[PDB]
Alpha-conotoxin Vc1A
Amino acid sequence: GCCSDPRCNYDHPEIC
């Protein structure tokens, strides 16, 4: 999951 990854989370604040 994207939100699981801190980078992906920080990159996609709208999705996560």
